[PDB]
Write a protein that binds this ligand. Sequence first.
Ligand SMILES: OC[C@@H](O)[C@@H](O)[C@H](O)[C@@H](O)CO
Ligand SMILES: [Mg+2]
Ligand SMILES: [Mg+2]
Ligand SMILES: [Mg+2]
Ligand SMILES: [Mg+2]
Ligand SMILES: [Mg+2]
Ligand SMILES: [Mg+2]
Length: 579
Amino acid sequence: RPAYRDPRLPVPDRVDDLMARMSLDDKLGQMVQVERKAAGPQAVADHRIGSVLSGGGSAPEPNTPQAWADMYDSYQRAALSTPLGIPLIYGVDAVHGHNNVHGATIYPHNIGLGATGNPDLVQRIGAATAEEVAATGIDWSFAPCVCVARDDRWGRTYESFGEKSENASAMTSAVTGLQGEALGATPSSVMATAKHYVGDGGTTGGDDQGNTEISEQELREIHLPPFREAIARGVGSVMVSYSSWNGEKLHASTYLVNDVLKGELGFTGLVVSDYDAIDKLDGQEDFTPDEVRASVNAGIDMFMMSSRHEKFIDYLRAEVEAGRVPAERIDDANRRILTKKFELGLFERPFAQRDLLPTVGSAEHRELARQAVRESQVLLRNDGVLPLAKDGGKLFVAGKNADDIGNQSGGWTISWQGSSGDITEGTTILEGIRAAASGSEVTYDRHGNGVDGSYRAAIAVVGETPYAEFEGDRPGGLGLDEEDRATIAKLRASGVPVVVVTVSGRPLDIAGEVDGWNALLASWLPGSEGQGVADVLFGDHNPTGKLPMTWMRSFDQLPINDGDGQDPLFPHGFGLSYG
Ligand SMILES: OC[C@@H](O)[C@@H](O)[C@H](O)[C@@H](O)CO
Ligand SMILES: [Mg+2]
Ligand SMILES: [Mg+2]
Ligand SMILES: [Mg+2]
Ligand SMILES: [Mg+2]
Ligand SMILES: [Mg+2]
Ligand SMILES: [Mg+2]
């Protein structure tokens, strides 16, 4: 009988009726998103908490798609038992597939997706990702990063679709895939998150969580446009950045968050903080009442925290009681959060859609991922060695990234940082090479040992190991490590033609060596379907990818970006094909 329980009522009328019935404590609870390790289902319900997230690597046991759905439903049952029965919204980083879930499809990271120049493909990946997430019940992915990465030293360069605002703006089609045209319209609708607002790709030195020291014009012309496009597509959520703009923390920027994002850009959705982001406002651990006040009054609606939910609620209650946070600010945050819960259909269909569990890691989704692997490959040098024949002559394969699911997936794969090894279901690049050259003997040695002049070609799959966020900052350099250079030198010493394949999250500093390589193929972080690399190597896919970042002649040029007058090794948009 309460109007908010009427599923035929317009959403704003349902929101009005529910909020009319809420105590201040109910409203404070809705503004909390707590990490699952800090609060089980009962505690989430006891505090009337609005949201739970899994941080990177935060899986139930066992890590299976069914166990995630069970975990989600367990939290939801408790939330539904409260006096108002406001359903929980659950968030997760599903940033290249449902990447915390073992056996989920792992798509190329954003930088390779930007290299495809194919927004329709990115949209299809958003839709397939949303299906695999909705199978586990989770309602909300912290994706896409619409960050415009301007300094390759940044540990999140690979989460960026490219260095040009055009790149990221075009790829906000990921939002349309994840959400559908209308949030909640289909059962696999999953709320998307434009992140991180704003300027995370512009920090000085590419330092993660750093300071973006640029004019308002530069901020608006380079970093803002992808947010505008995501909003035009109906993005349900925007996540604020840890970084600063001209020394002002984004999480305290009333101007950028309230005045520009909510006001000028007219964003009507849910503004969420980054993880324990208010804690970092004063540079000291934990959050103070001052940090709560500053960030709530900046206009943020929901606060993502690793623990201390009861302390957050107590602090915010006191701020509201004292009038330092106006009552309308709490109501604005609740109207935005509850609206998305109603739009997502959570008051009608709160539980995991287990009919979708068979799609998780399904062949059709892996075929889509393989197509993204193919199109993300960027051919940068080729003297004729590529494409390799399927003629039967012996091939040699080497490199620490040749036969490693985890290395080819990079960060945010099962764990937060990612890791090396066979960490989820997929096909390695070496396995794709063996299958492409199905009539050929294929010798593999990580370090190139055993290669000789009897081989018709040697393939060295080198580059980075997995990282995420600040752990991936590289102020010290981006050259190949000593193993990669030793292995390539061993292969070149055989006199055999050498194909170098970079598995990396960004351009690497290779200008001093590249002239010795018969071919160079940039593969980025292709994900679980490594066979798409062999598709290009053997000419099944004539390379179509183009560089989404300008490729340095020297580490000393960073930051290097299209139009800055510097002379690059390869310019933005560069990519060879077979001719
Ligand atoms: O892109 C930011 C991401 O959403 C982050 O907030 C994660 O949720 C957290 O780091 C998980 O450990
Ligand atoms: Mg599907
Ligand atoms: Mg759901
Ligand atoms: Mg750093
Ligand atoms: Mg603090
Ligand atoms: Mg495998
Ligand atoms: Mg650049």
